[PDB]
């Protein structure tokens, strides 16, 4: 449900967080928290900022 692609890319630290790729669709499925928002790339799962990713939302 609803699909969002980063416009920049985005550097982790810890495990829990994930790398976003610039250009890359992600599914987010559940906002953990209001920063923290979850999604899946290909086959890996993590946490990344919010602040990141960039909502495309089209009708075509």
Not at 14 to 24: A, T
Not at 35 to 58: A, C, R
Request: glycine letters at 6%.
């Amino acid at each position: 449900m609803r699909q969002c692609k980063v416009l920049f890319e985005y550097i982790p630290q810890n495990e829990d967080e994930l790398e976003l790729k610039v250009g890359d669709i992600i599914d987010i499925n559940e906002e953990v928290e209001e920063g923290w928002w979850s999604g899946t790339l290909n086959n890996k799962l993590g946490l990344f900022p919010s602040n990141f990713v960039k909502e495309l939302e089209l009708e075509h």
